[PDB]
Amino acid sequence: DNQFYSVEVGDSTFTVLKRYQNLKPIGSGAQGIVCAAYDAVLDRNVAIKKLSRPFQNQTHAKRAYRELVLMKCVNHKNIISLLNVFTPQKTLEEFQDVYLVMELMDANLCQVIQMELDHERMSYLLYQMLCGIKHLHSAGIIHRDLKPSNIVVKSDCTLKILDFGLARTAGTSFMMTPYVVTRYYRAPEVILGMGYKENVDIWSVGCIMGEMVRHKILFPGRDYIDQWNKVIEQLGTPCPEFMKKLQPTVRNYVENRPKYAGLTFPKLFPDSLFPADSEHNKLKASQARDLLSKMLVIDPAKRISVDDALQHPYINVWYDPLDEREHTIEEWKELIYKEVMN
Numbered sequence: 317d318n319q320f321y322s323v324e325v326g327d328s329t330f331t332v333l334k335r336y337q338n339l340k341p342i343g344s345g346a347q348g349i350v351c352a353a354y355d356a357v358l359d360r361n362v363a364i365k366k367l368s369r370p371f372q373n374q375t376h377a378k379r380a381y382r383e384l385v386l387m388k389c390v391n392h393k394n395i396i397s398l399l400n401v402f403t404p405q406k407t408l409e410e411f412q413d414v415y416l417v418m419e420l421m422d423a424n425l426c427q428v429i430q431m432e433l434d435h436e437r438m439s440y441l442l443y444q445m446l447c448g449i450k451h452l453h454s455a456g457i458i459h460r461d462l463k464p465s466n467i468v469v470k471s472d473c474t475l476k477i478l479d480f481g482l483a484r485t486a487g488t489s490f491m492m493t494p495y496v497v498t499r500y501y502r503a504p505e506v507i508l509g510m511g512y513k514e515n516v517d518i519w520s521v522g523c524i525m526g527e528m529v530r531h532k533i534l535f536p537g538r539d540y541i542d543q544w545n546k547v548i549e550q551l552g553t554p555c556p557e558f559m560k561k562l563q564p565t566v567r568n569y570v571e572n573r574p575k576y577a578g579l580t581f582p583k584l585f586p587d588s589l590f591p592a593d594s595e596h597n598k599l600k601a602s603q604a605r606d607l608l609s610k611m612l613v614i615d616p617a618k619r620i621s622v623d624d625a626l627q628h629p630y631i632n633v634w635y636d637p638l639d640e641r642e643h644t645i646e647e648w649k650e651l652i653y654k655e656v657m658n
């Protein structure tokens with residue numbers, strides 16, 4: 317008799333619309349609390365994400381509210397499209413949880429990274445990541461936090477970006493909850509608070525590509541100290557021109573780290589990491605290495621744009637012809653609720 321029904325999945329209760337049946341947890345990855353389900357109405361398999369009391373703090377609130385707003389005003393095949401948004405709660409007073417529905421994909425990008433991929437597959441994932449990022453950039457969306465965990469793929473190698481990243485005109489805080497923030501794919505400008513342009517997300521596409529070839533996180537670490545050491549340890553200390561654009565403090569710290577000449581890209585990503593059996597693969601390896609060498613550049617002023625990357629011989633083959641201000645818990649609960657209810 318209720319339009320909704322509850323089911324305990326993993327550890328989390330899922331009060332969902334009776335149309336969604338046979339709810340199996342994804343776990344990895346997922347991300348947050350994400351389910352697989354069969355939509356009776358649409359006759360297709362969907363993925364259901366539960367946002368638990370998202371208005372509980374500024375961090376959770378700003379992200380949920382901005383992603384909901386942006387999921388509506390964005391339309392691309394490599395960007396998250398919502399099939400449904402709902403709340404089981406009947407009033408603004410009763411409101412607790414938000415449920416976002418999208419099509420079911422088959423894996424996240426970390427899983428795909430672990431696999432031995434060919435140049436056909438590899439350049440197709442990379443073309444799509446850049447297509448998505450180009451679309452976000454045109455909508456005035458500079459991600460800054462692109463990572464494989466928030467990227468999903470289908471068996472046919474079709475890719476989608478699930479989030480809209482770092483809140484422009486913010487202003488991040490702490491988390492009283494136990495969850496890891498993946499910083500490994502963030503651009504040096506993010507690592508060193510610098511001010512950015514569109515190609516801040518290219519660094520991210522270079523870390524991912526690098527990991528597809530190496531099968532190891534390129535610049536790991538506990539924090540930006542550990543991390544920055546690995547960036548300069550491999551690509552070498554940035555040129556004096558880069559230092560000039562830094563804040564006086566950042567500049568002082570950066571200039572005072574032991575200097576490194578840096579490894580060359582054939583030594584960073586040797587021939588052994590790539591298929592070599594044919595001439596085709598021999599050519600595709602040097603083309604692959606060239607793209608990386610242009611994406612993994614500390615100084616943004618020198619690092620490759622999204623448009624130039626799509627016209628790179630490795631990628632180009634796939635070409636086919638309000639309101640970041642502070643609010644309260646009550647203020648946020650309303651902004652979010654009247655966006656669910658529209």
Ligand SMILES: Cc1cc(NC(=O)c2cccc(-n3cc(NC(=O)Nc4ccc(F)cc4)cn3)c2)ccn1
Nearest residue numbers: 344345346352363365416417418420421422423424
């Ligand atoms: C045919 C089929 C496919 C299955 N898929 C999986 O097991 C699987 C594994 C990892 C990731 C995903 N996947 C995850 C999402 N969505 C999200 O992670 N987050 C998200 C969800 C909804 C939103 F509105 C926004 C973000 C999609 N696919 C599915 C399982 C069984 N059969």
